[PDB]
Amino acid sequence: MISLIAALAVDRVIGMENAMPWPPLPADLAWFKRNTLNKPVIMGRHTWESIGRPLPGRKNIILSSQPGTDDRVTWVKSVDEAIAACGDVPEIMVIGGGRVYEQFLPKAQKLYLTHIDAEVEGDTHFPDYEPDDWESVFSEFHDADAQNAHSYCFEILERR
Numbered sequence: 001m002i003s004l005i006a007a008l009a010v011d012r013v014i015g016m017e018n019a020m021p022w023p024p025l026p027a028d029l030a031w032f033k034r035n036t037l038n039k040p041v042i043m044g045r046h047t048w049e050s051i052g053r054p055l056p057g058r059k060n061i062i063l064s065s066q067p068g069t070d071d072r073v074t075w076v077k078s079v080d081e082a083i084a085a086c087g088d089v090p091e092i093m094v095i096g097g098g099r100v101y102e103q104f105l106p107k108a109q110k111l112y113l114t115h116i117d118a119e120v121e122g123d124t125h126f127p128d129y130e131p132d133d134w135e136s137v138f139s140e141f142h143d144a145d146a147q148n149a150h151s152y153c154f155e156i157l158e159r160r
Ligand SMILES: NC(=O)c1ccc[n+]([C@@H]2O[C@H](COP(=O)([O-])OP(=O)(O)OC[C@H]3O[C@@H](n4cnc5c(N)ncnc54)[C@H](OP(=O)(O)O)[C@@H]3O)[C@@H](O)[C@H]2O)c1
Pocket: 005, 006, 007, 008, 013, 014, 015, 016, 017, 018, 019, 020, 043, 044, 045, 046, 047, 048, 050, 063, 064, 065, 066, 076, 077, 078, 079, 095, 096, 097, 098, 099, 100, 101, 103, 124
């Protein structure tokens, strides 16, 4: 089973100049960590560059046509290879970026989305999905606080 996990601001913005389009939201990072820990994570090369170190407690699989730049993670050259490299696990977590989400969304059976209540500039977007195809099975609204500058809502959707 393939799942996507992403944080989206207004107009589905996820990235700007190969970085996050907002300052860190520690609550969202905790959500991200809790949902990806002990699972394989698939990411695009640009997202690898934006993170810059292996995510601990996870099998890190990087999708790139280019030779790898770090022996601590697994480099693969195709979507099919990325999936194969995860082996026989219950859930593969696809963690972006925009080009990777586009390719895996049609394969996805679950989405873990953080809706970030911010209008910020972006050059990378989460793909358009048809809400009618998905059932919301979880939602939780949070306000901004001293540590998180924007309000946010966690949602989990399952494909009908
Ligand atoms: N808000 C969020 O939830 C979140 C999550 C993830 C990422 N982001 C942001 O999104 C941005 C990155 O997105 P992006 O679309 O520019 O890049 P990306 O999807 O992370 O990486 C794209 C790169 O991955 C490789 N790739 C993708 N598909 C491939 C395939 N089928 N076969 C071989 N290689 C493939 C290619 O690299 P090569 O050129 O090496 O071949 C491609 O240029 C960053 O700003 C990051 O901060 C945000």
